[PDB]
Amino acid sequence: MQLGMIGLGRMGANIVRRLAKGGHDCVVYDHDPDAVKAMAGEDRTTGVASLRELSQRLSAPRVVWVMVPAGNITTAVIEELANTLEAGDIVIDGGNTYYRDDLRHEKLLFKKGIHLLDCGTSGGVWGRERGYCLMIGGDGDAFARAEPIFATVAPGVAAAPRTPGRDGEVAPSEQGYLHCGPCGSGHFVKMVHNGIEYGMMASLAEGLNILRNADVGTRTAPLPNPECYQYDFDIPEVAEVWRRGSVIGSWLLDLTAIALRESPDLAEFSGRVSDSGEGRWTAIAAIDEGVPAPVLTTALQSRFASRDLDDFANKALSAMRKQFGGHAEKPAN
Amino acid sequence: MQLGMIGLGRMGANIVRRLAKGGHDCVVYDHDPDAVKAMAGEDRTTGVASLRELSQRLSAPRVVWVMVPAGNITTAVIEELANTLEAGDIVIDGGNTYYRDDLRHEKLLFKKGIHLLDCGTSGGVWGRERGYCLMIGGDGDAFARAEPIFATVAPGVAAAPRTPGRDGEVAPSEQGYLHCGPCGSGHFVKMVHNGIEYGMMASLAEGLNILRNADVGTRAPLPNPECYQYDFDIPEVAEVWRRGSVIGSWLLDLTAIALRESPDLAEFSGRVSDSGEGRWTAIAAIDEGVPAPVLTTALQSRFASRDLDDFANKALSAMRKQF
Amino acid sequence: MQLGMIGLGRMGANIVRRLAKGGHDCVVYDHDPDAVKAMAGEDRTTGVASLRELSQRLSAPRVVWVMVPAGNITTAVIEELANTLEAGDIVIDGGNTYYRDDLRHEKLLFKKGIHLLDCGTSGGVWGRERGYCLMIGGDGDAFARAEPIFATVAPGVAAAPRTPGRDGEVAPSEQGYLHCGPCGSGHFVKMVHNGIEYGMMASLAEGLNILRNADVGTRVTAPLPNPECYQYDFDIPEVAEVWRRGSVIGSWLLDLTAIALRESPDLAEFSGRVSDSGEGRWTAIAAIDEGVPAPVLTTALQSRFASRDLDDFANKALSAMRKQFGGHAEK
Amino acid sequence: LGMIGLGRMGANIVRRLAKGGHDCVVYDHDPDAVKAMAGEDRTTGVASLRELSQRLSAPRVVWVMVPAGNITTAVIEELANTLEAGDIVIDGGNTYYRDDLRHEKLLFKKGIHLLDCGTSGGVWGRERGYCLMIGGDGDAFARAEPIFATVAPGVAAAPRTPGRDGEVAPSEQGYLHCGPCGSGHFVKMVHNGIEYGMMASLAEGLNILRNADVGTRVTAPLPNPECYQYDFDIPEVAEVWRRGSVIGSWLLDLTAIALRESPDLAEFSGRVSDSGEGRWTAIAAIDEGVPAPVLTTALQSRFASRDLDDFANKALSAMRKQF
């Protein structure tokens, strides 16, 4: 069927290509018209430069997909589409929008008789060929109507064997997309998906670091039994070995195996790690719900400390440690 | 070829049967016949009730596998082999041995001609068919001798596409087994493997829990009850995350299976054991000055699920009564 | 000076009595005329039957202290205090209100020209005799205008020896009260006060549990290597006592800790389920927006959750994975 | 009794001991030390371990506070040959409570006793007294208890515990025989654990406040920047908490001092060392199955402050690039 895409970033673009390859008619716009002409070249690029233009070259009922930066710019666009589109149309925001914002947007465009489908999109660069895991919330009927687009841009059941106990017909979840519930529920689930992302990468990273320093007995606190810690491990080969037959098999380990093999010491990488903030929201939801989430919240708190956001607290320790114990801050290595 | 196998549990037995279909000769023995007895002439399988019957049964170099419950049972076996095994024969300890105990086991054997390869065995109860990831330490020539076994138990490179940039011939690492270094290093890596495993499990456990309670507004005051109105179908989220997402993993796959069998996991108590490798990994982290909150917090969650925080909760309760 | 106090729970009733004995004239209102009546006999105090009559008896400009259940009850009192009060009068919110909620109350009262003093009140029951540590956000003149009352409710610098490094005419902070900043500052600092309180509680508690089970080698799942290293039966109440002078971990909480362990050495009668206020939750939310790592504070909050079994589905999911990949049973 | 080594701790003990009234004979590896003995008041030095050993009677009691590690152990093995039987050695160093068990065995071989001592209070100990936790023999302790009460702060240091009626017990004094060998050091270890957690708590809260103005200074895109526009007088917030609230504590008063001297705490870099007893507290929790996230994460915050998270961060950065 026929679809419009506002925003052609590394992700906006790879969905219109994966869709054009899947047999759908795509229309598109990004403010920068060197990126709007980039696609014009491809199958069903159908480039365009107007919101009105767009609403024009698409026939209602129509479905438009939005992937522009979260925050003001997104809402800005929904604002317009409140005009530019007719009633009974459909709005898919696949941006990294906060689920509480999806509730205002659903409000606004309901007045104009548009439906908002909120699509939590994950996958990265691989998704144009692999496909994206989509987590969608919104009105039940408008999901039915746009379901062909999700089914095409999800990886599809072929991507992984069926789970044992899965019976007969293929359910959408097995395809890689899911109506997670009403409005906002798609971004909500994707939010928690990124929180789990953090927890898994920290578990890999901390482990790697334990292995890395198992030689501490070769080389202040006295170390009892330094005869015990005398190992120099091959971190690239342990990472690779764990990829088959173990319990921690995962994409992230696969990725870590690659990275360790290019750089065995990760020497050129920054010790400064950022967070998306979706990880922030996942931690705040957990607090709001009384759900203890130390593993995910500490993984996120380890990123903050990696940006020296623990600065003042550290000085307070050294300040306390000085006044009770004359304790000295040791010089930098 | 040939080898011995002391212990025939869920693991020891199943590696024997994957060892056998691989063309190896096994000599099964478990302190219980009902177990040994349990294996009724499984291809390439013969049962003895003698460590002695066991040793002399096969050719030098005399070497074999022990899969007995970790602790003094492992040690208590590892003294008997002292009294047997001749010399030049290497003991393969595939059990969940604390690597520090590996050091005492190896020297005790050094007072003889016996070699010791400590093998951290992974893969659980999927391993008969899937294969077991293995991390072994001890001597490189002793490892070289037993290498044909390690390749057969392991999953083989075919179990996963090769790493981008892996060119030429398959390395040990690629086939699912790896010689990690001197004695103890095998069980040391796998100890850390279980540490990482606790933190992956907990990462997705906590996440599902956040989702499961997103319907909080419908049922410590909560502002914005209108922001917590969702009744998520956890079995479906778990299987959507299998394809096209960052967090794919074998653990997610197994979590998906279990939610399909039981959408509320009602059968499970929530009282979670820990076998020790997670704790040893946390101690190693602490002695190395490596901060590991994410892994250690996951261990501590398992303690709490067993009500081991109870005395502290009592102290908290008793403090607030005062003010 | 003259003051209004709305509601009379133990907190609200005691601020009233700490004030009227400090030489302040108190006019009290409550939902419950029973509660209003208990304040009729008290020196310098007077009851009311409606907010209209409350302000009839306070000479504008008036200062009204609200001490009521946080949330929807607080908002309602304030909303009609917009009608009962004229321009330039001030409303002190001493209740346990969310600082973000103070933002909508300030705007809703300025529309009618009422200043909103937000006041975070700590210390509990001993405050009636020892004073409440006070933290006040809002307008600086309104604060200066109502400062005689904050001063009187506070403990007073007698309560603690002065700080080495301070000398002179006593600053407001050494009174036990302080002007934190614009509206919401007082509840903001007071919510972090509780977060720290949870942090210290927890540290003691974990500490004592570590002592409690040093005898773990005697009694005998993970093999405990080196069992001989854990063969101690510790006198926990004496250990807490000894720490009370000469250590670094001296604190009012350790003092209460020592008391509690003296009455009951095994805390046998006490609950293992620990509830949480909500400010501790506000604190942890604040830390995450700010990008401030607070594992200690937050992990103390999260321990509270797990003690009310709120960790349960997570636990079931761990066990479900364990049976899938290992055939592990639950004991 | 004498004192071996004279650091900030070992010396201000014997300055407090003598003013108290007993006589101590002083020693050290470095004679360049010995700023004492001016008198030393009630104090006279020595130039050899040997010289001191044949000194001050045969009721031998000597107190060691030299840095822990192997420098300790050498002293005790030397002090074994140089003390005669019946004399017991007090160890007030930060010794792993397990180190004491070989030493106390080492010493009763030749009839010398040991008493573990957990010595706290630091640069305030002289005028404020040093809280001591002592492990060992019940009679050896009793003979030395004169030393401990003049070393400790004295019951006067704080009001008696409400509900403690009757006569003074040693704990109110500031000292206590915690139990057998190693127990004295075990308690000071946990004290140090709790301390890390108590100041991390305050430290974290102060950091929270310090950054309550992130809505002005403008990583995630912050929602509700209006909710975070506060500049707090951190040295006054510190002060006001000292009266009338729950977090009253000595660590706060010292934090209120430092902030009055240094409003932004510039003279401290952020690099926080850890003497080791925090680590053993955490390891004891993990051996006992006691969950101690608050204390174990306070210590991990120190680790990260020394950049020991480094490789894990490089790891997370290398993973993100792969997306």
Task: Walk me through what this model shows.
The structure is a homotetramer. By secondary structure, chain A is of the alpha/beta class. Chain A has 2 domains: 2-162 and 169-182, 3-Layer(aba) Sandwich (Rossmann fold); 190-233 and 270-323, N-(1-d-carboxylethyl)-l-norvaline Dehydrogenase, domain 2. Helices cover 47% and strands 11% of the residues of chain A. Chain A contains 13 helices and 7 strands. Chain A has helices at 10-21, 33-40, 51-57, 72-84, 99-111, 140-153, 172-175, 185-212, 235-241, 251-262, 278-288, 294-306, 311-325; strands spanning 2-6, 25-29, 63-66, 90-93, 115-122, 133-137, 177-181. In chain A, strands 2-1-3-4-5-6-7 form a 7-stranded mixed β-sheet, sandwiched between helices. In chain A, strand 1, helix 1 (10-21) and strand 2 (25-29) form a beta-alpha-beta unit. In chain A, helix 4 runs parallel beside helix 5 (99-111), helix 8 (185-212) packs across helix 12 and helix 9 packs antiparallel against helix 10. The termini of chain A are far apart. The interface between A and B is large, with 107 and 104 residues. The PDB classes it as hydrolase. The entry lists the keywords Tecramer, Dehydrogenase Enzyme, NAD binding, pentose phosphate pathway, hydrolase. The assembly is tetrameric.
